[PDB]
Design goal:
The complex is a heterotrimer, with two copies of chain A and one copy of chain B (11 residues). Chain A has 104 residues and is an alpha+beta fold. In chain A, 19% of the residues lie in helices and 27% in strands. Chain A has one domain: SHC Adaptor Protein, CATH 3.30.505. Chain A contains two helices and five strands, in the order αββββαβ. The two termini of chain A are 18 Å apart. Chain B is largely without helices or strands and 11 residues long. The N and C termini of chain B lie close together (7 Å). Classes of the chains: A alpha+beta (104), B little secondary structure (11). Chains in contact: A-B, A-C, B-C. At the A-B interface, strand 3 of A face loops of B. Chain A: This is Growth factor receptor-bound protein 7. Chain A: It is found in: Cytoplasm; Cell junction, Focal adhesion; Cell membrane; Cytoplasmic granule. Chain A: Belongs to the GRB7/10/14 family. Chain A: It comes from Homo sapiens (Human).
C-alpha cells in the first residue's frame, strides 16, 4: 500500500493507457511506471526501451506466511514494489535497461 | 516467459 | 536411476510429488511434450510444484535451463550439480520422487 505514495504508480490503468502515458512524456529510454493487473495482487511494470513500451508481469506469492513479489517466478523476490523499483534503478536484472525516469 | 508479457528469464 | 520418470504429464508429476509428501527438495525429471528433445525438472518448494524446462543445444551437445549460461553434457550431471548448488533453483534437490 506504500506504492500508492509513489508517483510512478498509476494504480489500475490499461496497457493502452500506459503506452499513451509513456508516449506523452517522450518515450525516453528507462521511462517507466507501475500499475495494477486487470484481473489482483498482481502488477505490471511498463518500461520504455528503444522507443517501445514493454510490459513486465509482477506476481505475488506467499511465504511463511507473508507475501512477496517477483517478475521471474520467484528467482528474484521483493517485499514490495518500492523495493523492486529501487533495485532496478541500479540493476537491470531481467530488464533490458535500468529504470531511469518516473512516468508520473 | 509469461505469455503476453516481455519477461525473459531462465525457464 | 530413480529420478527420471520417462514420460508423464505435468499433472501426473504434481500428483506423484504430492503423494510423496510435498517436501522441500522433492523432485523428478521427465520428458516434455513436446520437444522430444526437451525435458522438465519438476521440483517442490513450499508445498508448491514448479517446472523447469531443460533444453538441448549444440556448440558438442548440451542441456541448459537458462539458455547456455550453465551447461551439462547429460541430465545426471545437471541433477548432481543441483544437489549441491541452487543455480536458478529455489532450493537444493535432495529427495527423489
Amino acid at each position: 500500500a506504500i506504492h500508492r505514495t509513489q508517483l510512478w504508480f498509476h494504480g489500475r490503468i490499461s496497457r493502452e493507457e500506459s503506452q499513451r502515458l509513456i508516449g506523452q512524456q517522450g518515450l525516453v529510454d528507462g521511462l517507466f511506471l507501475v500499475r495494477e493487473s486487470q484481473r489482483p495482487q498482481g502488477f505490471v511494470l511498463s518500461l520504455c526501451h528503444l522507443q517501445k513500451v514493454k510490459h513486465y508481469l509482477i506476481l505475488p506469492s506467499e511465504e511463511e506466511g507473508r507475501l512477496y513479489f517477483s517478475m521471474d517466478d520467484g528467482q528474484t523476490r521483493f517485499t514490495d514494489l518500492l523495493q523492486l523499483v529501487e533495485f532496478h534503478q541500479l540493476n537491470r536484472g531481467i530488464l533490458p535497461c535500468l529504470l531511469r525516469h518516473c512516468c508520473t | 516467459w509469461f505469455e503476453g508479457y516481455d519477461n525473459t528469464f531462465p525457464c
